[PDB]
Write a protein that binds this ligand. Structure first.
Ligand SMILES: Cc1cnc(C)cn1
Ligand SMILES: [Cl-]
Ligand SMILES: [Cl-]
Length: 152
């Protein structure tokens, strides 16, 4: 992948986990991307999240690890992630693994360059989730949730 080409503004579209509580309201991973800045050794993210009904910002920096294509970041424990698929100018799919207290879960995210994506791309992401043991009932379409768009 040419990671420089993922730079810029993105929107969170679909959000999925094999630990559903983490992506429900008040879950730590119910976060909405605004941008990804590509740096030499890292990716800098800005997110929003809802806390007690109010939009709030989260800024994270993910560092390259010793494994090609993998990044790590501390947020509600220790996370690693990789990019599964992208065409740079419409969609990107991430796969992240969280560790906390020696337990783990997966998070998968579909971001778009616009506030929504078509049904074809969504469907393909759902199948990719299933390929990781993330069942359809654990995939949330954030376009029908509060994504703090007004806060962007
Ligand atoms: C919290 C978080 C979620 N997703 C990515 C890709 C990075 N950080
Ligand atoms: Cl809480
Ligand atoms: Cl919204």
């Amino acid at each position: 992948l040419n990671v420089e080409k993922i730079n810029g503004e993105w929107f969170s579209i679909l959000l999925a986990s094999d630990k559903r509580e983490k992506i429900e309201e008040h879950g730590s991973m119910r976060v909405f991307v605004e941008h990804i800045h590509v740096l030499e050794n890292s990716l800098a993210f800005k997110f929003h999240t809802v806390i007690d009904g109010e939009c709030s910002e989260i800024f994270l920096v993910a560092d390259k690890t010793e494994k090609a294509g993998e990044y790590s970041v501390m947020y509600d424990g220790f996370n690693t992630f990789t990019i599964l698929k992208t065409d740079y100018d419409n969609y990107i799919m991430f796969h992240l693994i969280n560790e906390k207290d020696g337990k783990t879960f997966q998070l998968m995210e579909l971001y778009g360059r616009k506030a929504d994506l078509n049904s074809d791309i969504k469907e393909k992401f759902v199948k990719l989730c299933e390929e990781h043991g993330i069942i359809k009932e654990n995939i949330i379409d954030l376009t029908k949730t509060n994504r703090c768009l007004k806060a962007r």
